[PDB]
């Protein structure tokens, strides 16, 4: 039933962080089977994402996926999963590159659609 | 030895959030005994802070203090601490090439946070 996941946020003071995450959540939050059990900044950085993911894996072992606000954080997350033997966890991300929406928000929307479609196929009810 | 704490940030897209937090950290980060174990927006909102703090207290029972980017969040955090029986936790709050008023308010709040907590928890 439930698909628990974690999210790695970018730098909290940087607008791309909010736009990517908000776009992602505009989609994923419509599918209540997806449960965000952890959400933390990894500062758009690979080494920080490794450290943060290592901690998330210990506190929330049930996660099936991690969505990341840039490629560097996804790479660090993937390394941490490998180091923990958690090669089962799926890693996703969007790297980019106010009234209305922009590039980072729409990219988060499309990334969220893919995240839902992929994970509902792997983990149907 | 160490003094773990949590920070409740304002609305992430609002510049006062960052001026206040950056001024606070310009002081606190110089003192290595203070360790920020959780940092999360509570949207400058009391009821959001209540819910966010309830979650932080369960993930990070080691915390001895919470610093908040406005009064509304401090009040929500205080209520959450009471609800969890954690009346031991101290709550604090305050309500770009140059520096501005919110930054200097954060600096003064951080100086007070350090002084107060170092008197409560001396080496």
């Amino acid at each position: 039933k439930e698909i628990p996941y974690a999210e790695l946020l970018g730098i909290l003071s940087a607008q791309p962080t909010w736009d990517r995450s908000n776009g992602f959540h505009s989609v994923v939050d419509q599918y209540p089977e997806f449960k965000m059990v952890a959400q933390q900044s990894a500062e758009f950085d690979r080494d920080t994402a490794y450290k943060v993911t290592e901690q998330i894996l210990q506190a929330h072992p049930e996660i099936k996926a991690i969505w990341c606000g840039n490629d560097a954080m996804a790479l660090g997350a993937m390394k941490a999963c490998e180091a923990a033997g958690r090669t089962d966890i799926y890693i996703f991300g969007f790297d980019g590159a106010m009234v209305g929406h922009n590039h980072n928000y729409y990219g988060g929307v499309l990334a969220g659609e893919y995240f839902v479609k992929f994970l509902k196929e792997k983990y149907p009810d």
Side-chain angles (χ1 to χ4, degrees), chain A residues 84-107:
Chain A
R86 291 298 309 276
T87 50
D88 57 306
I89 297 175
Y90 296 109
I91 306 296
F92 302 79
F94 172 70
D95 202 59
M98 160 181 102
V99 162
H101 301 297
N102 69 37
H103 199 79
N104 278 322
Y105 179 92
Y106 289 128

Side-chain angles (χ1 to χ4, degrees), chain A residues 57 60-61 63-66 78 81 86-91:
Chain A
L57 291 170
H60 305 281
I63 62 161
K64 295 182 185 295
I66 306 174
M78 197 158 180
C81 288
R86 291 298 309 276
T87 50
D88 57 306
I89 297 175
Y90 296 109
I91 306 296

Side-chain angles (χ1 to χ4, degrees), chain A residues 5 23-32 34 111-113 115-116:
Chain A
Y5 70 99
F24 174 83
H25 283 284
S26 77
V27 177
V28 180
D29 296 357
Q30 300 305 121
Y31 294 86
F34 290 86
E113 292 178 359
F115 178 90
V116 170

Side-chain angles (χ1 to χ4, degrees), chain A residues 26-84:
Chain A
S26 77
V27 177
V28 180
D29 296 357
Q30 300 305 121
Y31 294 86
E33 62 272 47
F34 290 86
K35 297 285 174 12
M36 187 171 63
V37 299
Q39 178 191 62
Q40 191 163 344
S41 182
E43 315 187 11
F44 283 138
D45 179 81
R46 178 200 290 221
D47 292 311
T48 303
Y50 183 94
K51 180 191 322 200
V52 170
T53 300
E54 191 176 50
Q55 294 162 0
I56 290 174
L57 291 170
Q58 294 177 257
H60 305 281
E62 81 274 10
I63 62 161
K64 295 182 185 295
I66 306 174
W67 197 86
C68 303
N70 79 341
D71 284 351
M73 291 187 303
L75 291 171
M78 197 158 180
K79 286 236 205 151
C81 288
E82 173 76 30

